[model samples]
Target chain A: MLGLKTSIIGRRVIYFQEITSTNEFAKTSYLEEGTVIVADKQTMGHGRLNRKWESPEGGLWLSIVLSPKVPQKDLPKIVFLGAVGVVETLKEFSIDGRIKWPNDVLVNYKKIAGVLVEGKGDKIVLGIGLNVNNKVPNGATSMKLELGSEVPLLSVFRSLITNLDRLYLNFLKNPMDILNLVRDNMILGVRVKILGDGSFEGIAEDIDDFGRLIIRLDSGEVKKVIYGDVSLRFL
Target chain B: MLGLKTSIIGRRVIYFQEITSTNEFAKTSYLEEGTVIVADKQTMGHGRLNRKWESPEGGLWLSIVLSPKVPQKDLPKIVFLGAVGVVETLKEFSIDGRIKWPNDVLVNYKKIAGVLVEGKGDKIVLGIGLNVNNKVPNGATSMKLELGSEVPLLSVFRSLITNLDRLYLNFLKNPMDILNLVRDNMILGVRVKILGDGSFEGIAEDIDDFGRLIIRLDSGEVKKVIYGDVSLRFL
Candidate 1:
């Protein structure tokens, strides 16, 4: 399996026993384009906004390094690339999945997978963490709970890499195609609570041209939230 | 000098004989927030957009690790804060320093200093590279050339830290105050060329609220350059 993907990525896949953060390790390495780092567990994994990511045993934790020629402004769109790839893999198991803003893949309104993108020079390491084959340790859930069966981690990983390769090629050719596809699938247009020091409720409308959230606040002013975490109201 | 400034910054300054990049090293170390990494020479110093900076003897190459509550959108403004600090320090010698867009201090249209800002979690490391007593290398200049005399490196460093402290304090208290000051003193409205894959001429206008240079291209479109190298028409 690694052989087929290695031919596609044009680099060897390096597996590590322990790493502080795969993202940090990739930065210090001479990782050519498409080098992937799969760690047994991350001591210090993180998500967007630098929040701690759950990387306990039985979870699929990995990081893929990419050196694209895309502009800095277009880099944020990579989040969508990873989301679609992950969600497509989940769908293969008869599980319906949706994507949350920036980098979360959710099923039944609970996160099942996430990605963290780190930039070093022209290189980018897309750190991926997914709940597969792992018993959702302490307040987490797996597709097995919803589907009543265990899912093979290796099959899911193969599907993910295949989807990612196809998506990445499309992006290198025309990023807007992928960008527009992700925008159309956004779970916005609902009421969500913007979380931070001073939390507030607003109508999540759409993501702006620069990928900022366009939230219509209670005061009738359209607020462009470029920071802070937000939670969607199921109602 | 380190002891006194340590009191203000809230951490001890760690001096390194040599490192790949102080910013990278500091970010990876056990050093807490407010820690400063002072290196006599950096083997792999870098400027914005991953441009290699020449670090030789008699040069000041360092990085400051800071943990700020500012949002990602606001992070770009910290570049201006650092530029003002460098320009003010150079102004002590009546060098007529002007801040180039983003984070470079120029004397007579030559780059005397540069800064690179990187973030991990809530922490940011502002990597600074300046030619203090070193001779001007190709496509670079130094304070020595502009001052026409040897200046005490320690005194210059002390003044720089003082200016930086004042500017950072203002940033913590009132970021807009410092932002306006830097914007007012920005060296815009000149014929400039944007350097990337393809070069083009434009009139540098005002900077957007996000610290991007608003260049009025020959096509009359206001292109906000978020990242890249640029040069002004000195003659």
Candidate 2:
């Protein structure tokens, strides 16, 4: 059982031994705001752009429903807020984690978690998959693997819910605060290739107030990338 | 019979006497690409931000499902494409129609139709409510009222589907061509107030390539107005 200490988020929990995808479940089900749908494993886990997300046993696979009173333009910020929550939760484990732009959480340049933010009407679903006590793929790490021991899934879940509630409430108060938190931990001042509208090389400038990636392109024009797969240049 | 002339825009048509909202139905249904759902009337028709849309018997209420092969950033153009289709259809009726940037069609400075584009996953549902042969609202006009006679519903629907198919084909070939068609007929170079993230007075400059409104604010700062309700200023 998840000992949630939050006031809003995770107030209602729906657990499943196995499901297709937590995000899809929350999307199709009649879930209230702050409802959390967790599954021990996903038979068909997916992330942004229909990418296969490996969710086996021992991983934290869950989706949270939220009804934020924000304009449609600001909805993308929810993904970053989820990233910040995962990063904050990792800090409680003495792990130095940082956000990788739009949705990935990285520790020492290795992705340890990912977030997917989707919206329908006034409802938004934040799907998060963290490698807790599971075997991760290449270029990814898990908390148990990093610590060389099995971490308590309930404890991790409680910490994540607590941090998510705090960040979400702060976002509802002033979204700029959450944006600053993401920016402070984001990887900036680096060459990155944004894969959308044709691949373009640019310097990752900053995450704008609108949660768009502001990149200074090689043509010396600063452009805002709305959605794309970003890769940092290792030059 | 639909008598759809388009190759891919309306390959399949589902007709209903009355429905809550065609868009909602299409969004929740298992429909294929280029499938169109037409309804005689909407019992609970709604648009963006849950605004009530007067969808009486004489109006045309329909939704089209499209699986456009474009990046997520270019999806907003579907709304303008729907507007262009309405504008082109109006021209066939000898009524001069212009676009009111983003999603409204206006004739003689009066609203005649509206477009609402909603997307889920890779599929997009474009909901259009056109005042074809209906009673006019206070600030809105119908095709019948403008033409001083009732127009044949089948003829108008055929013309709309034809124009939409042509424009959509052109969009797949070169999206900027459709953007240009919308821009050439959009109401620009006029004083307007954009309501979102606080109100600001500006001149409706142009629709950018990405379907965002480029507004020249009174403070001499040219800004992109994204996801906002725009009102024409009398002064």
Candidate 3:
């Protein structure tokens, strides 16, 4: 309805002038499939585990509501799929980005956008806070900054919503192919350290069927990680 | 944002002067939590799968959007919850209705309303069509018919919206407390043949943990049935 040609994603969109966070609304709310909530600005924007996200005017503070077809145990895969959608959308704008392990998309290894896949009941709210022609914090970048010019927010939004719809309808609904793409986007084969419970440092190698990151430690041992924050070795 | 209050269920209400079907709008469009889509009249109204439903002017034809907090395998339970929601609202009007398992809610064995739990991704659009002061076909009835008087459309609607929110929130919050209310009104311990693959006649004893119908058949064999065309057993 909003000039989006996608079959199932963004079929109906609820636009907000400003809000606390799209994800917060989505998590506490029940949204129909393909419904999106986007705000021009966000006050209390956040990432996974309540990580603060710098959301300003002219940014794309968005959340896509999905009633997942996949099993609850496999919900983490949607986070990977969300990263794929962001990078694919950036590709349309000639902006290259790589997924930083599970949650963030980086351009020139600086955070440009982040995807937060949160489960509320039977649905997954994919919060994609992309810095498009907006002010960002010091270790972060935006589409306007990276491209040296302004980018229309709707163009990026439409592309992302469509890219995600295609991926979900065709690929994301089936986890393995989606996982492979997620692996491709991940900064694998690099020296990295995972932060969280059962913390470890190793060479990021692969993502298993469970979407666990398989890390080959320097001690000649391999570990599969289910949850954590991953940092580059040189970061 | 309507007159009736619930924490999450009817947070947003989308009204249609006339539409093809409320469920069709829900199926094709994305709506937010507590979002309710209602139509004054539906041109192509249909029930579960694709059975035609007579949704004329003055009926309470509604669909409530919910991204379930429950698991995927437990989606059927929401339908039961929807039935419970419908009958509870009727109880407000002093009209009693019995759940004819899986879908319809009957008054004096004639459908006063029907609940269609349609799934699109991880969301359930609980479609409730109540004949409130509206013309209905033979073998079915309405609130006006059951009450022997004209009913205010808004009164029936607000009560339903509020009632459903209570049951849904009750299930999500307490999880155990509300389904017992569902079990309380069910037409259980009745003769029944669950129609579908591996069909059999039995005593419809109770609704199991996962919302499956527990049937004790001839030879004392017990079976738990999942999805199927139901009723006409013990009708």
Instruction: Supply candidate 2's per-residue lDDT for B160.
Output: 89
- Candidate 2 CAPRI category: incorrect
Model 3 lDDT tens row, A77-158: 7887789999998888998888887788999889999888776777778888889888889988998999999987767886
Candidate 3 at residue B19, lDDT?
Answer: 67
DockQ of the candidate models in sequence? 0.01, 0.01, 0.02
- For residues B34-102, write the lDDT of model 1, one tens digit per residue: 556666677888766667788876777777777766666677777777788888888787777788877
Q: What's the DockQ of model 2?
A: 0.01
> Whose DockQ is greatest here?
3
Query: 2 or 3, which is superior by DockQ?
Result: 3
Name the better of 1 and 3 by TM-score: 3
Give the TM-score of chain A in candidate 1: 0.87
**Candidate 1 or 2, higher TM-score?**
2
Reference-based TM-score, model 3: 0.51
For model 1, residues A1-235, the per-residue Cα lDDT tens digits are 0223423342434444445777777777776677666655678988767678877655677777787677777787777788888888888887877777767787877788887777777888887888876666555567767677877665666677778878887788776776566667667778877776666778888887766778898799897776335543434
Give me the candidate number with maximum lDDT. 2
